[PDB]
Amino acid sequence: SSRPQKKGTAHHMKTRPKKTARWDIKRGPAVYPPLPPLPAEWTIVS
Amino acid sequence: TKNGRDSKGQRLGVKIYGDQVAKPGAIIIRQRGTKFHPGKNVGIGKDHTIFALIDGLVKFEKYGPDKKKVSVYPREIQPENPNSYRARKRENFRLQREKK
Amino acid sequence: LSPKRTRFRKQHRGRMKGISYRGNRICFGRYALQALEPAWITSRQIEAGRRAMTRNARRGGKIWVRIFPDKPVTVRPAETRMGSGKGSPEYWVAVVKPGRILYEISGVAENIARRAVAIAASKMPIRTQFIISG
Amino acid sequence: MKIRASVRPICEKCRLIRRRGRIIVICSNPKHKQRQG
RNA sequence: UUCACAUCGACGGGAAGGUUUGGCACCUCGAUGUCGGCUCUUCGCCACCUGGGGCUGUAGUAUGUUCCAAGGGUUGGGCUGUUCGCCCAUUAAAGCGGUACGUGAGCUGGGUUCAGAACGUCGUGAGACAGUUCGGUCCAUAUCCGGUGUGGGCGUUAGAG
RNA sequence: CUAUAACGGUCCUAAGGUAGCGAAAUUCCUUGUCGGGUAAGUUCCGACCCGCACGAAAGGCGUAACGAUCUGGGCACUGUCUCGGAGAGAGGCUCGGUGAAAUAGACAUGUCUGUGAAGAUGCGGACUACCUGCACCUGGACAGAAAGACCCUAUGAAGCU
RNA sequence: AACCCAGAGCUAGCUGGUUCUCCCCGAAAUGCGUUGAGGCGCAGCAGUUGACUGGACAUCUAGGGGUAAAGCACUGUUUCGGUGCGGGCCGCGAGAGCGGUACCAAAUCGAGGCAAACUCUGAAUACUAGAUAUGACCUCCAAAUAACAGGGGUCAAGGUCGGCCAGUGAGACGAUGGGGGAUAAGCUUCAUCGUCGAGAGGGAAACAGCCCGGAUCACCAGCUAAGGCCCCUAAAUGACCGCUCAGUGAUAAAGGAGGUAGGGGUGCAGAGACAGCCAGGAGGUUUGCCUAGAAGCAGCCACCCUUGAAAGAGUGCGUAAUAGCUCACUGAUCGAGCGCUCUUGCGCCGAAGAUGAACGGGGCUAAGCGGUCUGCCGAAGCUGUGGGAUGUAAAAAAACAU
């Protein structure tokens, strides 16, 4: 004994998924080419 | 058995910091003994309180290397204004009232 | 082992905060036992270690209890923790932070100093190591 | 054997071999024949 | 005898356990029935005895200690309501424990927490003492899971012995 | 001899326990020492005495007889026990007839571990298990029974002084 | 202290109960007083309504404080040495004197710390008080082409007084600074914030209080956050650099270590090394004492010199002790890589419980952990499309903001 144990909430901070590798923390999503705009989608003109 | 636990809870701050606006008669310092001495335009009190005599500003400064020497001044300036927002709010009160 | 004058009977706890300066370079002696881990050290540890290096040296060289406890720790009986009336007459404690010198010993040849201060490190609750007077 | 979890070479002639994990001492004098951790 | 480590290990230090005494008081006061015995389990080990081994300040016979080992074993009584609290006679030994201090919809009620009564003491007094002493109806025709037995349908691709 | 004080001095009250009895239905420490009894007896009998806190009509001490009284040891007698066994009767069991009960949110109602108001069939992982009867046992469903009787609270109720 | 009827539907600050829809706003569990603390009164925080307002957010500058840290001026303690005052002791002698002691102690000095009720000093934040800007969109008019300034119309937003009225008054955990405790508790008590309370959803296996995030609705549409990409479950068993061989990867220390990849220092390596085979390995001398004996090896003192390649009054065993044995040291062959040293990273032992593997399982030598670059999955979040509702507001809308 002489060592406490880690309970609810307390247990969570020790043992939740952390992304502890500086690299993957850094990253950002792909961007893209700007994708020039798109036409209308509907027309009464018929 | 405890014997202990008899605290008073009294409060004694500085009331008007340097470069605030002192009314006349208003208290500058409520103190226990004389940390800050009276300078000019202030009056000591019965219990060493330091209160303003004329409107103006409070200036804490050394009256000796050690002492505070609190003081007051007329400090009247700036009549000039530059804020659009206050005028805007007032303008809205009326426009909306008229609309409704 | 304790102070003579009881300035204030009881004294509440504190906390460790690592050394950064006053690393207590070396003043007396030539070989010190530098602490590394912050902790308390009672007066009874101090007794123990001192005995260790005195009877180990046993031929020459002078010990130096570089630190003196000077703060009381209390202990309460088994009465449901009501009011902490009397426990200061119990052990005293020296708050020892990192980078601090615990003993100093001169007038001793090199390796004899190593055995004295190594044993002395065994009697004592925190990981240390011995330093020479640089 | 003296299963000391931390003992060390003591005779001048201790050999300190590790086998199947266990760090052990073997000396010509079996008083000294220790196995560690 | 000399010899720190065959054996005991002062002075002090670092741990694991969770079963003693405790600290909190989180569930349970439209209720989670207490001590000790009986019967019946089953599990843990850091091992008491039986299986194998080192080391021994082991001549042998005894041992002393540690190491792997839970497969098994782990009496009968006298005293007390009272698990190493204990003398008797053995015995290979006559272990320590966990299981709501295992087990009261299985059992007894010797103790304690009911009403009677008394002793010492406290209280002027009613009464009282985690002091003592004598007496004091512990209820039950299993729905379900569980377990021990035993069947039937049906599956087994045609149907059966 | 050493000890225990026959006998003395001090404050004290109104005075400082007489006779008997005594570890006692009163002695806590305490299974108090010692003797008898027993193979072994914290119970028991006889004594000693530092009576924690016995004691003279809230009587002291002892008594022949009497006790569905409490208590200790005896001889005879035995299933109380060692260590069970067989038997007869009434139930249980099956078939014909009549036919309740308490309980009951709905239950398509597994084990181990983990979790969780910190002791789950209802959540997670793994294992295990055809469906459904009947007899039998009672470890769980914090099973039923009585809105606990212990503990506390209420500027609750009631009884006694 | 009967039973029935009546006052009596007694009283209960205590338990239980309180039924149909939608819409908008939506708390507290704090202080004070209380025969009061599992009540109530006031404040504090909702609603709704009427004024007067000015902000709120960011930025910057002033003003006081004595906290964190530091410090020994103060107070209180605190070790090491200096100094010696003065005192005790020996006595001489019938007075105090020069002194001596490995002597006890008061001020001081040098070195050296420590303190919630110590400060010569002293931050960051916090607080108070000032000025300084500009938020979101539109429609625009004049543009080559933007931008923005030019206006106009909206929308969004702070407070300080009041009115009518509530509920709340033991919060919980997490982070930090602390008291109490044993620097024990999912303990208790306060101060500043977060979530839960009153809040869903995804990650965390399950799992109020940890992480992202905030749920008006529809969608068999898409991009991401926290977290992840072998199977059970979505998505690379994807790239290259390293490190682990224990199933570690899920849990705990002191201590131990020729485990393992590196690093920091150190000397040696043809006036050749650590390996081994080797050879040699003393004279004084039995060192003096003690002891029966002590002769290197019970114990203690001197502890050197001579000889030489080299020998320590001998390293260990042993002998009654001697002797004996062997080490250190030293030359030759073989042959040029080996000692020492502290720490970094990952590991091993130390590390054992009671129903049955308990750590998601299958498993894995990468599907583990350290590092970087790329693609993807991932929520009720953001987008896209389409409805609803509140006000803003006074009218068809439409547009915002929720």
XYZ file of all heavy atoms in Angstrom, chain E residues 29-30 77 80 88 100 105 120-121 125 132 147 149 152-153, chain F residues 26 39-40 42 53 55 119 131 133-134 136 141 147-148 161:
650
model
P -32.854 2.512 2.200
O -33.997 2.698 1.289
O -32.011 3.652 2.579
O -33.442 1.919 3.544
C -34.432 2.651 4.231
C -34.355 2.455 5.718
O -33.003 2.613 6.181
C -35.139 3.454 6.538
O -36.501 3.091 6.633
C -34.434 3.429 7.892
O -35.019 2.460 8.731
C -33.021 2.967 7.537
N -31.984 3.965 7.854
C -31.258 3.700 8.997
O -31.540 2.675 9.618
N -30.285 4.530 9.406
C -30.033 5.615 8.691
N -29.060 6.413 9.122
C -30.761 5.920 7.506
C -31.728 5.077 7.125
P -37.568 3.631 5.572
O -36.879 4.608 4.702
O -38.781 4.031 6.320
O -37.908 2.354 4.689
C -38.431 1.169 5.264
C -39.515 0.594 4.392
O -40.550 1.592 4.226
C -39.099 0.231 2.977
O -38.566 -1.080 2.899
C -40.383 0.411 2.178
O -41.208 -0.733 2.314
C -41.050 1.569 2.913
N -40.782 2.885 2.305
C -39.584 3.536 2.288
N -39.624 4.689 1.689
C -40.937 4.806 1.295
C -41.564 5.852 0.597
O -41.059 6.899 0.193
N -42.906 5.597 0.380
C -43.554 4.470 0.787
N -44.853 4.399 0.488
N -42.976 3.482 1.440
C -41.670 3.710 1.657
P -14.388 -35.474 20.218
O -15.717 -36.094 20.024
O -14.127 -34.104 19.742
O -14.078 -35.469 21.767
C -13.678 -34.275 22.405
C -12.825 -34.577 23.601
O -11.434 -34.504 23.226
C -12.940 -33.609 24.753
O -14.067 -33.853 25.565
C -11.625 -33.814 25.475
O -11.664 -35.023 26.210
C -10.675 -34.020 24.303
N -10.001 -32.783 23.876
C -10.223 -32.083 22.729
N -9.460 -31.033 22.618
C -8.691 -31.048 23.762
C -7.687 -30.165 24.209
O -7.252 -29.150 23.670
N -7.176 -30.561 25.428
C -7.574 -31.663 26.124
N -6.957 -31.881 27.290
N -8.507 -32.493 25.720
C -9.011 -32.124 24.537
P -16.677 -24.241 31.264
O -17.643 -23.946 32.343
O -17.027 -25.237 30.229
O -16.342 -22.883 30.521
C -15.932 -21.744 31.256
C -15.704 -20.573 30.341
O -14.519 -20.814 29.545
C -16.799 -20.330 29.320
O -17.871 -19.579 29.848
C -16.064 -19.625 28.193
O -15.893 -18.253 28.508
C -14.695 -20.307 28.246
N -14.570 -21.438 27.304
C -13.896 -21.219 26.133
O -13.429 -20.134 25.844
N -13.796 -22.304 25.306
C -14.281 -23.568 25.545
O -14.117 -24.455 24.709
C -14.963 -23.714 26.787
C -15.069 -22.673 27.609
P 0.542 -30.687 29.312
O 1.720 -31.221 30.032
O 0.689 -30.157 27.939
O -0.569 -31.819 29.246
C -1.197 -32.295 30.423
C -2.252 -33.312 30.092
O -3.386 -32.654 29.480
C -1.853 -34.358 29.073
O -1.070 -35.396 29.621
C -3.196 -34.815 28.540
O -3.836 -35.667 29.474
C -3.955 -33.495 28.502
N -3.838 -32.833 27.187
C -4.612 -33.313 26.151
O -5.361 -34.270 26.365
N -4.540 -32.735 24.943
C -3.732 -31.708 24.751
N -3.703 -31.178 23.528
C -2.924 -31.188 25.794
C -3.012 -31.778 26.988
P -19.445 -13.492 0.659
O -19.873 -14.514 1.631
O -20.404 -13.005 -0.348
O -18.903 -12.248 1.484
C -18.901 -12.276 2.901
C -19.632 -11.095 3.485
O -20.527 -10.543 2.511
C -20.515 -11.385 4.687
O -19.736 -11.377 5.868
C -21.568 -10.282 4.637
O -21.149 -9.159 5.392
C -21.582 -9.889 3.159
N -22.842 -10.168 2.465
C -23.164 -11.223 1.664
N -24.370 -11.146 1.165
C -24.857 -9.955 1.677
C -26.076 -9.298 1.522
N -27.070 -9.789 0.788
N -26.250 -8.125 2.160
C -25.245 -7.655 2.898
N -24.049 -8.183 3.115
C -23.923 -9.342 2.470
P -31.728 -17.970 5.401
O -30.557 -18.039 4.500
O -32.256 -16.666 5.837
O -32.931 -18.710 4.679
C -34.098 -19.037 5.411
C -35.315 -19.162 4.533
O -35.505 -17.951 3.774
C -35.284 -20.258 3.492
O -35.658 -21.502 4.041
C -36.255 -19.759 2.431
O -37.584 -20.087 2.783
C -36.088 -18.247 2.529
N -35.235 -17.690 1.472
C -33.907 -17.402 1.553
N -33.413 -16.892 0.459
C -34.502 -16.827 -0.387
C -34.648 -16.377 -1.696
N -33.654 -15.878 -2.430
N -35.869 -16.454 -2.241
C -36.868 -16.949 -1.521
N -36.852 -17.401 -0.281
C -35.627 -17.310 0.229
P -25.693 -3.907 46.997
O -25.469 -3.719 48.447
O -26.826 -3.215 46.345
O -24.366 -3.495 46.229
C -23.118 -4.060 46.583
C -22.014 -3.522 45.719
O -22.109 -4.097 44.397
C -22.045 -2.031 45.477
O -21.431 -1.317 46.526
C -21.313 -1.895 44.157
O -19.920 -2.019 44.358
C -21.781 -3.138 43.426
N -22.986 -2.904 42.629
C -24.212 -3.342 43.005
N -25.142 -3.048 42.159
C -24.483 -2.378 41.161
C -25.008 -1.830 39.983
O -26.176 -1.840 39.609
N -24.036 -1.231 39.219
C -22.717 -1.177 39.550
N -21.923 -0.550 38.678
N -22.207 -1.689 40.659
C -23.147 -2.278 41.417
P -21.978 0.123 46.956
O -21.085 0.629 48.017
O -23.434 0.044 47.195
O -21.711 1.017 45.675
C -20.390 1.376 45.321
C -20.340 1.967 43.941
O -20.963 1.057 43.007
C -21.108 3.256 43.755
O -20.399 4.391 44.195
C -21.395 3.257 42.266
O -20.236 3.624 41.538
C -21.655 1.780 42.020
N -23.082 1.426 42.106
C -23.902 1.829 41.104
O -23.510 2.503 40.178
N -25.206 1.450 41.236
C -25.764 0.698 42.238
O -26.964 0.424 42.222
C -24.839 0.300 43.230
C -23.564 0.669 43.126
P -31.512 8.765 45.258
O -32.001 7.774 46.239
O -30.617 8.355 44.160
O -32.786 9.462 44.620
C -34.093 9.104 45.031
C -35.111 9.603 44.045
O -34.759 10.940 43.648
C -35.195 8.820 42.749
O -36.130 7.767 42.877
C -35.624 9.858 41.721
O -37.036 9.961 41.700
C -35.078 11.156 42.301
N -33.884 11.697 41.633
C -32.584 11.388 41.897
N -31.745 12.077 41.182
C -32.540 12.912 40.427
C -32.189 13.886 39.473
O -31.067 14.219 39.093
N -33.301 14.506 38.944
C -34.586 14.219 39.284
N -35.518 14.934 38.659
N -34.933 13.315 40.172
C -33.861 12.703 40.705
P -20.511 -7.655 31.779
O -19.707 -8.611 30.985
O -21.713 -7.018 31.199
O -20.943 -8.405 33.109
C -19.963 -8.877 34.016
C -20.574 -9.247 35.339
O -21.216 -8.098 35.931
C -21.673 -10.282 35.286
O -21.167 -11.595 35.177
C -22.423 -10.032 36.583
O -21.735 -10.626 37.669
C -22.300 -8.519 36.724
N -23.516 -7.788 36.308
C -24.541 -7.713 37.214
O -24.476 -8.252 38.301
N -25.635 -6.998 36.799
C -25.795 -6.359 35.595
O -26.835 -5.751 35.349
C -24.680 -6.476 34.718
C -23.602 -7.165 35.096
P -26.027 -24.415 -13.338
O -24.819 -24.410 -14.188
O -27.366 -24.531 -13.949
O -25.918 -25.604 -12.301
C -25.064 -25.494 -11.181
C -25.439 -26.464 -10.093
O -26.595 -25.990 -9.364
C -25.858 -27.850 -10.525
O -24.789 -28.678 -10.925
C -26.574 -28.346 -9.291
O -25.633 -28.637 -8.274
C -27.327 -27.095 -8.879
N -28.672 -27.070 -9.461
C -29.096 -26.426 -10.580
N -30.357 -26.609 -10.831
C -30.790 -27.427 -9.811
C -32.060 -27.974 -9.538
O -33.123 -27.854 -10.148
N -32.031 -28.750 -8.401
C -30.934 -28.979 -7.622
N -31.101 -29.757 -6.552
N -29.747 -28.477 -7.857
C -29.756 -27.724 -8.962
P -25.510 -35.633 -10.907
O -24.354 -36.551 -10.792
O -25.715 -34.830 -12.131
O -26.842 -36.467 -10.690
C -27.750 -36.642 -11.759
C -29.038 -37.265 -11.303
O -29.894 -36.250 -10.730
C -29.883 -37.865 -12.408
O -29.464 -39.157 -12.783
C -31.273 -37.822 -11.813
O -31.412 -38.821 -10.816
C -31.231 -36.481 -11.111
N -31.640 -35.378 -11.988
C -30.818 -34.578 -12.720
N -31.455 -33.664 -13.381
C -32.779 -33.876 -13.058
C -33.935 -33.189 -13.469
O -34.033 -32.222 -14.225
N -35.075 -33.727 -12.906
C -35.088 -34.792 -12.056
N -36.283 -35.184 -11.609
N -34.017 -35.439 -11.662
C -32.906 -34.928 -12.205
P -37.817 -40.417 -22.882
O -38.382 -41.712 -23.311
O -36.419 -40.072 -23.225
O -38.796 -39.301 -23.445
C -40.199 -39.445 -23.297
C -40.937 -38.211 -23.746
O -40.578 -37.102 -22.893
C -40.626 -37.721 -25.147
O -41.381 -38.394 -26.134
C -40.942 -36.239 -25.061
O -42.339 -36.029 -25.138
C -40.500 -35.917 -23.645
N -39.118 -35.418 -23.566
C -38.040 -36.106 -23.084
N -36.937 -35.421 -23.097
C -37.317 -34.205 -23.617
C -36.542 -33.064 -23.869
O -35.334 -32.898 -23.673
N -37.315 -32.047 -24.396
C -38.656 -32.119 -24.650
N -39.226 -31.026 -25.161
N -39.389 -33.185 -24.421
C -38.654 -34.180 -23.908
P -40.935 -38.334 -27.672
O -41.925 -39.110 -28.444
O -39.500 -38.680 -27.767
O -41.092 -36.803 -28.068
C -42.351 -36.260 -28.430
C -42.204 -34.844 -28.925
O -41.511 -34.060 -27.928
C -41.372 -34.673 -30.185
O -42.137 -34.856 -31.367
C -40.814 -33.265 -30.041
O -41.778 -32.304 -30.438
C -40.636 -33.146 -28.540
N -39.281 -33.443 -28.056
C -38.919 -34.647 -27.535
N -37.698 -34.682 -27.103
C -37.232 -33.410 -27.341
C -35.967 -32.874 -27.076
O -35.001 -33.435 -26.568
N -35.879 -31.553 -27.453
C -36.888 -30.838 -28.022
N -36.588 -29.570 -28.320
N -38.086 -31.328 -28.280
C -38.192 -32.619 -27.914
P -21.823 -11.659 41.508
O -21.442 -11.872 40.097
O -21.057 -12.340 42.567
O -21.722 -10.103 41.795
C -20.508 -9.567 42.295
C -20.621 -8.108 42.640
O -21.541 -7.959 43.746
C -19.314 -7.474 43.082
O -19.245 -6.134 42.617
C -19.401 -7.518 44.601
O -18.659 -6.516 45.260
C -20.892 -7.354 44.843
N -21.362 -8.030 46.052
C -21.104 -7.437 47.251
O -20.501 -6.392 47.342
N -21.572 -8.112 48.339
C -22.260 -9.301 48.333
O -22.624 -9.790 49.397
C -22.498 -9.854 47.046
C -22.049 -9.208 45.973
P -8.593 -38.305 36.184
O -8.633 -39.365 35.157
O -8.441 -38.660 37.611
O -7.388 -37.339 35.821
C -6.061 -37.830 35.745
C -5.390 -37.379 34.475
O -5.906 -38.123 33.359
C -5.610 -35.930 34.092
O -4.683 -35.087 34.750
C -5.442 -35.924 32.570
O -4.083 -35.707 32.232
C -5.786 -37.360 32.188
N -6.966 -37.571 31.336
C -8.177 -38.095 31.690
N -8.998 -38.260 30.686
C -8.257 -37.859 29.596
C -8.559 -37.789 28.233
N -9.731 -38.144 27.706
N -7.600 -37.346 27.403
C -6.427 -36.989 27.918
N -6.023 -37.005 29.179
C -6.998 -37.461 29.976
P -5.192 -33.943 35.743
O -4.102 -33.634 36.689
O -6.521 -34.326 36.262
O -5.352 -32.686 34.792
C -4.280 -32.271 33.967
C -4.791 -31.508 32.778
O -5.333 -32.425 31.799
C -5.936 -30.556 33.061
O -5.497 -29.325 33.595
C -6.601 -30.423 31.701
O -5.871 -29.525 30.882
C -6.423 -31.829 31.136
N -7.609 -32.671 31.338
C -8.275 -32.948 32.492
N -9.300 -33.734 32.329
C -9.289 -34.003 30.977
C -10.115 -34.781 30.168
N -11.156 -35.477 30.609
N -9.834 -34.842 28.862
C -8.792 -34.152 28.410
N -7.940 -33.379 29.064
C -8.250 -33.360 30.359
P -9.540 -23.873 36.143
O -8.402 -22.945 36.307
O -10.068 -24.555 37.343
O -10.698 -23.031 35.446
C -10.514 -22.441 34.160
C -10.682 -20.942 34.209
O -10.291 -20.345 32.939
C -12.092 -20.434 34.493
O -11.990 -19.257 35.290
C -12.592 -20.050 33.105
O -13.631 -19.100 33.092
C -11.322 -19.488 32.496
N -11.309 -19.413 31.030
C -11.179 -18.157 30.490
O -11.091 -17.154 31.163
N -11.155 -18.096 29.134
C -11.244 -19.153 28.269
O -11.214 -18.944 27.058
C -11.371 -20.419 28.905
C -11.397 -20.513 30.233
P -12.268 1.774 46.101
O -12.804 3.080 45.654
O -11.518 1.696 47.374
O -13.482 0.755 46.191
C -14.402 0.831 47.266
C -15.750 0.300 46.869
O -16.207 0.992 45.693
C -15.797 -1.169 46.491
O -15.875 -1.977 47.662
C -16.991 -1.254 45.533
O -18.203 -1.447 46.243
C -17.034 0.153 44.932
N -16.651 0.275 43.519
C -15.487 0.788 43.038
N -15.447 0.842 41.735
C -16.684 0.366 41.341
C -17.259 0.175 40.081
N -16.627 0.455 38.946
N -18.507 -0.322 40.018
C -19.123 -0.605 41.164
N -18.682 -0.466 42.408
C -17.440 0.026 42.431
P -22.930 -2.761 51.381
O -24.190 -3.364 50.893
O -22.842 -1.299 51.560
O -22.624 -3.446 52.777
C -23.515 -4.414 53.301
C -23.287 -4.634 54.770
O -21.960 -5.168 54.985
C -23.317 -3.389 55.624
O -24.629 -2.952 55.918
C -22.520 -3.819 56.841
O -23.299 -4.669 57.660
C -21.435 -4.668 56.192
N -20.232 -3.875 55.892
C -19.905 -3.216 54.739
N -18.753 -2.608 54.805
C -18.295 -2.884 56.079
C -17.107 -2.501 56.737
O -16.178 -1.814 56.312
N -17.054 -3.011 58.026
C -18.017 -3.780 58.604
N -17.789 -4.179 59.853
N -19.127 -4.142 58.005
C -19.197 -3.660 56.756
P -19.039 -2.082 -4.183
O -19.522 -1.372 -2.981
O -18.045 -3.168 -4.031
O -20.312 -2.651 -4.950
C -20.188 -3.341 -6.185
C -20.511 -4.801 -6.010
O -20.302 -5.143 -4.634
C -21.942 -5.226 -6.315
O -22.053 -5.636 -7.670
C -22.212 -6.379 -5.345
O -21.981 -7.628 -5.973
C -21.149 -6.188 -4.263
N -21.664 -5.941 -2.907
C -22.382 -4.918 -2.348
N -22.594 -5.097 -1.075
C -21.957 -6.294 -0.804
C -21.812 -7.024 0.389
O -22.253 -6.746 1.508
N -21.083 -8.189 0.194
C -20.552 -8.597 -0.993
N -19.873 -9.744 -0.997
N -20.665 -7.918 -2.094
C -21.365 -6.800 -1.912
P -32.453 -23.918 -25.389
O -32.502 -22.445 -25.316
O -32.031 -24.726 -24.228
O -33.909 -24.390 -25.797
C -34.711 -23.625 -26.677
C -36.075 -24.243 -26.800
O -35.919 -25.599 -27.274
C -36.825 -24.399 -25.496
O -37.503 -23.231 -25.092
C -37.738 -25.578 -25.775
O -38.831 -25.181 -26.585
C -36.834 -26.446 -26.622
N -36.063 -27.427 -25.840
C -36.645 -28.646 -25.564
O -37.799 -28.837 -25.959
N -35.944 -29.575 -24.893
C -34.704 -29.313 -24.503
N -34.041 -30.253 -23.838
C -34.081 -28.079 -24.769
C -34.795 -27.180 -25.442
P -41.524 -25.387 -19.162
O -42.367 -24.285 -18.658
O -40.146 -25.550 -18.647
O -42.266 -26.762 -18.895
C -42.060 -27.475 -17.692
C -42.388 -28.930 -17.872
O -41.461 -29.524 -18.807
C -42.256 -29.784 -16.633
O -43.394 -29.692 -15.802
C -42.035 -31.173 -17.208
O -43.263 -31.741 -17.628
C -41.207 -30.860 -18.449
N -39.762 -31.017 -18.238
C -38.821 -30.111 -18.632
N -37.606 -30.479 -18.356
C -37.762 -31.709 -17.752
C -36.785 -32.584 -17.246
O -35.564 -32.424 -17.230
N -37.357 -33.723 -16.715
C -38.693 -33.991 -16.688
N -39.047 -35.156 -16.133
N -39.616 -33.182 -17.163
C -39.082 -32.069 -17.686
P -43.288 -28.996 -14.363
O -44.463 -28.125 -14.167
O -41.934 -28.421 -14.208
O -43.424 -30.215 -13.359
C -44.049 -31.419 -13.762
C -43.335 -32.608 -13.179
O -42.291 -33.042 -14.075
C -42.614 -32.362 -11.869
O -43.489 -32.413 -10.761
C -41.560 -33.455 -11.862
O -42.137 -34.692 -11.481
C -41.206 -33.547 -13.338
N -39.997 -32.784 -13.699
C -38.753 -33.312 -13.391
O -38.688 -34.384 -12.791
N -37.641 -32.641 -13.738
C -37.737 -31.496 -14.380
N -36.615 -30.857 -14.708
C -38.990 -30.938 -14.715
C -40.085 -31.614 -14.367
P -40.467 -33.027 -4.385
O -40.964 -33.567 -3.107
O -40.965 -31.726 -4.863
O -38.888 -32.925 -4.297
C -38.124 -34.017 -3.829
C -36.665 -33.671 -3.776
O -36.112 -33.617 -5.106
C -36.337 -32.313 -3.200
O -36.387 -32.299 -1.789
C -34.953 -32.062 -3.757
O -34.000 -32.823 -3.036
C -35.073 -32.672 -5.145
N -35.365 -31.670 -6.181
C -34.263 -31.048 -6.706
O -33.156 -31.374 -6.271
N -34.415 -30.122 -7.661
C -35.627 -29.813 -8.083
N -35.712 -28.886 -9.035
C -36.784 -30.440 -7.562
C -36.608 -31.357 -6.610
P -29.802 -11.177 -3.414
O -29.282 -9.831 -3.110
O -30.427 -11.965 -2.337
O -30.817 -11.100 -4.628
C -30.343 -10.695 -5.898
C -31.436 -10.659 -6.921
O -31.775 -11.999 -7.328
C -32.750 -10.072 -6.461
O -32.736 -8.657 -6.479
C -33.739 -10.687 -7.437
O -33.692 -10.016 -8.683
C -33.144 -12.073 -7.635
N -33.759 -13.063 -6.748
C -33.302 -13.526 -5.552
N -34.078 -14.414 -5.006
C -35.107 -14.540 -5.912
C -36.258 -15.318 -5.911
N -36.559 -16.159 -4.941
N -37.098 -15.231 -6.947
C -36.787 -14.378 -7.921
N -35.731 -13.586 -8.039
C -34.928 -13.714 -6.981
P -46.152 -0.910 7.337
O -46.835 0.142 8.115
O -46.661 -1.271 5.997
O -44.640 -0.474 7.153
C -44.204 0.048 5.912
C -43.192 1.145 6.094
O -43.366 2.116 5.055
C -43.288 1.941 7.382
O -42.556 1.297 8.409
C -42.731 3.316 7.010
O -41.339 3.371 7.275
C -42.940 3.371 5.494
N -43.894 4.373 5.008
C -45.247 4.250 4.932
N -45.825 5.286 4.387
C -44.776 6.120 4.058
C -44.730 7.381 3.461
N -45.806 8.046 3.057
N -43.528 7.952 3.272
C -42.452 7.291 3.686
N -42.365 6.103 4.261
C -43.582 5.569 4.430
P -42.204 2.025 9.795
O -42.194 0.976 10.836
O -43.096 3.189 9.983
O -40.709 2.540 9.597
C -39.661 1.642 9.270
C -39.137 0.891 10.474
O -38.159 -0.069 10.041
C -38.423 1.700 11.546
O -39.356 2.263 12.459
C -37.472 0.688 12.190
O -38.116 0.026 13.263
C -37.252 -0.334 11.076
N -35.886 -0.413 10.526
C -35.581 -0.150 9.229
N -34.332 -0.327 8.932
C -33.774 -0.776 10.104
C -32.436 -1.137 10.368
O -31.481 -1.120 9.593
N -32.263 -1.541 11.674
C -33.261 -1.590 12.598
N -32.885 -2.009 13.809
N -34.519 -1.255 12.369
C -34.714 -0.854 11.100
P -44.377 10.601 39.621
O -44.964 10.349 40.959
O -44.976 11.611 38.726
O -42.861 11.012 39.799
C -41.936 10.077 40.314
C -40.546 10.632 40.315
O -40.164 11.001 38.976
C -40.357 11.904 41.106
O -40.222 11.659 42.488
C -39.112 12.497 40.476
O -37.962 11.838 40.971
C -39.287 12.098 39.019
N -39.842 13.171 38.170
C -39.081 14.275 37.891
O -37.970 14.425 38.353
N -39.677 15.206 37.078
C -40.917 15.123 36.513
O -41.330 16.027 35.794
C -41.637 13.948 36.840
C -41.083 13.036 37.632
